[PDB]
Amino acid sequence: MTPREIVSELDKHIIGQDNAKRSVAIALRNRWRRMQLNEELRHEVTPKNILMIGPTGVGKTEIARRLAKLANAPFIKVEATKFTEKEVDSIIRDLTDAAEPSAARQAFRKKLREGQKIKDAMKLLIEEEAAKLVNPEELKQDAIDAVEQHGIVFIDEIDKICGPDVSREGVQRDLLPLVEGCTVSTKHGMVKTDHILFIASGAFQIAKPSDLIPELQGRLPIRVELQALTTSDFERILTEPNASITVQYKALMATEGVNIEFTDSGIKRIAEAAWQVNESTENIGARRLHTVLERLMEEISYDASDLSGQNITIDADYVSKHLDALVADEDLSRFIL
Amino acid sequence: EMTPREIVSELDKHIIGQDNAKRSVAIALRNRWRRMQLNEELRHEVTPKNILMIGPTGVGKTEIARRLAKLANAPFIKVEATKFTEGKEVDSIIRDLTDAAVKMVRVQAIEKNRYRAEELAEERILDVLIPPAEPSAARQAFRKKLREGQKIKDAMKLLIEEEAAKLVNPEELKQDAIDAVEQHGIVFIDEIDKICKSGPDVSREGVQRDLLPLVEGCTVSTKHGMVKTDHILFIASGAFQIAKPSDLIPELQGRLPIRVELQALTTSDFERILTEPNASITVQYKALMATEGVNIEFTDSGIKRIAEAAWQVNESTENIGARRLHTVLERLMEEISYDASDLSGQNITIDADYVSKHLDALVADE
Amino acid sequence: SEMTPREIVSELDKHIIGQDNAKRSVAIALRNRWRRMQLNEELRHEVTPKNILMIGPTGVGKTEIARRLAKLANAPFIKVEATKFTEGKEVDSIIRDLTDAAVKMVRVQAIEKNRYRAEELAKLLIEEEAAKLVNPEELKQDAIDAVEQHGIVFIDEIDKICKSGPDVSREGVQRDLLPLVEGCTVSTKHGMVKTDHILFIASGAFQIAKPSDLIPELQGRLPIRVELQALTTSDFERILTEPNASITVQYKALMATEGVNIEFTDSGIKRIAEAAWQVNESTENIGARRLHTVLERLMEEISYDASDLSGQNITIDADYVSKHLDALVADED
Amino acid sequence: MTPREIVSELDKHIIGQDNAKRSVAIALRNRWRRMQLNEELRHEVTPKNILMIGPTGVGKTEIARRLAKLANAPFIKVEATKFTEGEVDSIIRDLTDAAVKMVRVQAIEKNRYRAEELAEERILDVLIPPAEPSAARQAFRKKLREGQKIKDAMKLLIEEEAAKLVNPEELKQDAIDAVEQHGIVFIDEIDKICKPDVSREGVQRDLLPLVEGCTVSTKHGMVKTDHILFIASGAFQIAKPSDLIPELQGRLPIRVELQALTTSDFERILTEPNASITVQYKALMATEGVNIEFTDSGIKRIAEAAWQVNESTENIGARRLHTVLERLMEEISYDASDLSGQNITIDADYVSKHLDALV
Amino acid sequence: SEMTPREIVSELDKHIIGQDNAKRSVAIALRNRWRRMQLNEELRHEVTPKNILMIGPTGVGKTEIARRLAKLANAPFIKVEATKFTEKEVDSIIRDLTDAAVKMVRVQAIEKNRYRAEELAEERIAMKLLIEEEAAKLVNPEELKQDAIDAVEQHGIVFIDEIDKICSGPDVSREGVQRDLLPLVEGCTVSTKHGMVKTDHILFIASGAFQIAKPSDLIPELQGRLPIRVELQALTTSDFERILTEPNASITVQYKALMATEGVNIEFTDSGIKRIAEAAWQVNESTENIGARRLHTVLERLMEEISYDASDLSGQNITIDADYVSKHLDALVADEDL
Ligand SMILES: Nc1ncnc2c1ncn2[C@@H]1O[C@H](COP(=O)(O)OP(=O)(O)O)[C@@H](O)[C@H]1O
Ligand SMILES: Nc1ncnc2c1ncn2[C@@H]1O[C@H](COP(=O)(O)OP(=O)(O)O)[C@@H](O)[C@H]1O
């Protein structure tokens, strides 16, 4: 896939944040560009690591998740603060763990596909045949090739490791061999980290990327800042993305025989509700949309069974009825939303 | 496939009141069945709607989670969030959850083997009495004397093992507990409010970051197998009097879409809890004293003054919720529970005068 | 066991002196065990053991009641100091060490059975026959049933884990203990054990703190409460003689081994109890444990010469007690 | 052994400290008295533990060492401060490991006799193959005992025969019986864990199950601590035994204070004890062909030298005698090879010559 | 070995220069080993090794005496830094010692196998595979793995460096290490995968500068387990000149044979050696005194140009003279910052 083909696929899931989509696409394209090179340059070239920057919940992780899911690559998210108190080599360990017929012959074959120890026996042959078809030395060694060639690692909240300054910067030095390249031992095999791609992310409000150790700053060639989502983006996130949470709730109630429909003004007042809570108390980003939506739909989701065969409409009046009383009280909103 | 009203109606048989918490947990369990009906793509994108219970201790937050999992026959575990402040790894939650799912699926599988094994064990022991060369007449004549009762007597126990071992399938069982954990698993994290936010704030919020992969989804290794946490349901609870859910790390606040506050229990609810729930503690004491041949009966005014006694202690000193009912009842019944052997064949009646006699002197002194 | 609660206390009176309320409280818990088994399938799960919290000064027999109670029921038993977990070891070790005691308990008891049949069918033959007679799956699984059904655990000095820095570590131990009483499942090399029906006995002086200082989930898991009274001088005189295999009876048979006959006068027993009481008041009160230190100091001269005194009848009188003791009791230093 | 026989044997090694000798003798004698009792009392009776008290180096440990060596019992010395940092159960584990090597080497001593007889009968079969002892059978038995792969083969038969004679289930289980019935443990510097007060008293609670009785798992087997005897020791100048936790104070029924050694005690310790350090240096130089002899005034000035150092700097007790003696004899001990066939005399003038400049 | 104490010192003089008191002290300990075996069954248990405490500034040869002493006795040896345990279990000392004794007795057993195997392999005949099968056929593992245990228990030697640094907060952890070391000297038994070893008869050598602390600051139980005390003197400029040449396989002799490998012949003038010792002394006085270790840093700095060109210099005879030493050094010794 060309870099524009990657961004266009990411637009199907993430909304906006095109600069982060363009930056990740360059890294994945360099993978294919490297394989076309000669024996010497393939060793000298190393992945272009990315450092995402921005407030929480704007989709930094989702880009890394959909990117690895787009490439079918191994992926893991690790909190950098986990190591302030486990060995750093566990990152690669957990990454590898995630990585002509007779007439009676047809007459019985028909009754078999139609359905029918006998019934238990069909399941045991799937194991014996799939084991006979599978190649374990080509499989356990494939996950190693999938990690080494295609592997991806997302390091969240890297800005928080910038008394404590020795332990904080000590985690950076422990992370250093993985990016500069090294070899880690695992029960599944011996993995090399040279060509693994990495994505670090942090708000960087307390610290700056310059505060990172110099050896780490040079191993993160690509830098990108992700913009904060607005109320208008909340309305888009509720609907536009494939399998959006509103589409999920609609199909969920459809299973009960109920038909949910959201008005544009009803969607607009949900985004306004999630925005008010982030401003009134604490800003969690687009994550607030999930808490507000379930609070609005809790009465329908409970009653949907008796509501089978009915068409429910979520309007602006319905949103204000179940929400504005909760959003008006900030003491309650921190608990309930 | 129970509908959400069927879930609360079942929960009303045990928990009293707290309907909003019942409605909230029912929505999460129903989304499980609603997800399976969806297509291949949506089943991955949809994730469990996690709940945050809030309220004073002892109002039934855990009992809702306990009866909900018991209602679904799902694996369940309660974990204290403060255990990780000191230390143990956070991954142990899934490990201990699978160990409960293993024993759960195993004992339930024994319930299946308990039947078939007795039939195959009988056919084995009849081969020694009537060796083979429609059941034979002597085959039934011995089969009758066997069921009537009778090394020989030890032999029937050994065949239950060999037959249940011959009947059990370990690859469908140990892999069943994994499917029970991944699909149906439930985890209750008590006192999550105590890990909210300088020195402790790093160790407190560090536990939140350690918990983060389990809710965002991850893979944990266990001796029983490799489990994925993506579809596991979680229930966090806390009083949140010192802190508020907004004090939680932002990645955690968005992984708890459903929030509910549980109301403080009243004196009237205490009277209902003593009697109304199936196998209520009063019914338990009644059958226990029946074992000794004694008949316990509680008057409505006697039940009313026990609930008033437990309420006064929670207000006079510390409010433990409905847990106070257990301490008060045993203190009232301790004299009968000691004498029940000698009281066999007698009808004892717990009245308002009896409750005040054994209690009011104790409740009067804080 | 089907013993009625009065039969339990009467058996406990053979060892412990006084503290009847603690005896009555433990008997109710053991009787509820037999009462539960007669119930139906539903109530047997809902009913849970009535846990007891002993309260009182050290050395008044809190542990002995739990020890003799488990010994009376032939149940597995373990004593654990709650402060051990302040530093560290996992709390689940309680069930692990309990099963290890239950394993050795059911094994040595199973040896007593195979001891009989193997001698008929038969040192080497005792092993082959007992192995031929034993069914290890009924034994290692018996200790599990003995722990789950009959198990008992005594948690000493629980008052010291009550409630800023230590209060987190102190109350943290309470939360770690919480699953065991509320019920849970612990994995052991011997098997998988469930804690739902295990009985527990917590004890503490509670002079610094109070049971109300315990976490609320823990206060509701200890339905039965009892306070143990301080021992008097008269109880010391009873402890010296009345209990089966009392320390005076132990010294008598010990000297009987050497051919010597010890006999204690009532006034001689009376002045030993007065001696142990004065030391507890003059310096520090250790409870009935003082009786052990005072008696050995009195008998050290007889115990030393007992070989040469074979064939003699020695009498411990009030004059003998004052001769070897009062000079020592007079100096508190 | 009766308690007077124990103290009299202890006097052959330790000098003075009779009260500590009388106290340890009562504990070892209660062991034999318990076995003679009935089934019930043998369980109820528990060892009478001892708490030694006094300044360092006065022989507290030597009493425990010679006591266990007198009883052939397993023994271990453990520093209580080792657990301040970090498990207490290792005490029983290391105790059994010493008991394993103790019973094993002692079992080799038994097989040492019979195996030489059976090994000789094996080696005579190759020299005198069989078709009253034969003429050549004795003729080779004589040349064999006179001395002579051949020479290597006699060692291999000692293993096969000692293995054929030994019963390992009676051995690894014997060390367990030696630990449970006869075991002894010396806990040095117990006073330093008295009321850090949480970590100090926490070690006491960790030690509590071992004295109150418990069961510890080991690779060699499962051991019970109920009947093991223990000896705790401490200077108790900073703290007192009353500062110990109450459950620990009642598990130490016997208390004894050991007196500080005097200059007169030093002179006795140098000579009177069996295999005293002066006797050791004498036999060592005798190996080189030299004769050491110490004058009474020369012994008197060595004791005065060790006393002055303990007073002038730090008092280490009788341990000072070892450092002073080796410093005096270092010139002889080096030259002992060339001094063979000579009689050296250690006099007061010799002691002052090599020492007083240092003191 | 039956060597007398003077024979031990005379052999030590072939390697170490001076420090005769430390040589006499170590010789008395090794001789007591042979003196003990001649005693009866009783005295052999009661007598215990006379442990030594070396004292002096760093680099004066405290370790070299312990190394050459064990190498002289063919005994197992290990050097352990006492500060390693301030933060591993102390029992690892005996474990690592047995691991050195295992490889010591094994390679030495190969020296007996290297000969016989070649004869039996010739009779069989691939030549490399038969050395294994024959050496495995000739080797006795129960006499070997048990030999290293006898070598550790009877002949074992341990050197504990910088013991003076373990003499309120650190004082507990510092003195805690002493108590952990105490059982090893008083005698004990340690479990190892190779077997069960007893420490009663092992000899130990502790060393420290003792400028911050004194041996009296050691715990009393440890002071009595170190009967022999010796102080090692600081090396002079004249001693540096001797250390460069006199000792067998001296660093000057090592550099000469190294350049001989390239076909070059190195020769040092007496004045050239004299100006090397003067160079190392000036650095120790001008900045920090590291002892004789300064000789290694100065020599390699002087010879770095020859060591670089030695390939192209094959067949040539080099002479290190006073003019050559001053040319490559005095400019560096001048500037103390460099
Ligand atoms: N641009 C976006 N498109 C789709 N979903 C989003 C977007 N931004 C946030 N989300 C939702 O909010 C959550 C974002 O969390 P995460 O990406 O881990 O935070 P961050 O991006 O700060 O690392 C995800 O669960 C995701 O479903
Ligand atoms: N509504 C209720 N119905 C029935 N029992 C209750 C109720 N509330 C509390 N209880 C009893 O009190 C205890 C509640 O403890 P728990 O539910 O763990 O506290 P919380 O709800 O604060 O987490 C349980 O043992 C339960 O038997």
Ligand SMILES: Nc1ncnc2c1ncn2[C@@H]1O[C@H](COP(=O)(O)OP(=O)(O)O)[C@@H](O)[C@H]1O
């Ligand atoms: N009432 C009693 N009857 C018999 N022995 C007693 C009694 N009280 C104390 N003892 C003796 O004193 C000791 C009591 O210790 P323990 O019971 O552990 O203390 P606590 O009761 O405070 O937990 C035991 O060794 C026991 O032999």
Ligand SMILES: Nc1ncnc2c1ncn2[C@@H]1O[C@H](COP(=O)(O)OP(=O)(O)O)[C@@H](O)[C@H]1O
């Ligand atoms: N009374 C004594 N008799 C013989 N040797 C003694 C005596 N007192 C001390 N020693 C010697 O001094 C050392 C005493 O150390 P130790 O007994 O461990 O000290 P403590 O008695 O304070 O525990 C031993 O090496 C021992 O040889």
Ligand SMILES: Nc1ncnc2c1ncn2[C@@H]1O[C@H](COP(=O)(O)OP(=O)(O)O)[C@@H](O)[C@H]1O
């Ligand atoms: N007297 C000496 N004879 C020979 N070499 C010595 C001498 N003194 C020091 N050395 C050399 O210097 C180094 C001394 O280090 P070491 O002996 O470990 O120091 P220390 O003696 O302080 O323990 C060794 O590498 C050794 O080669």
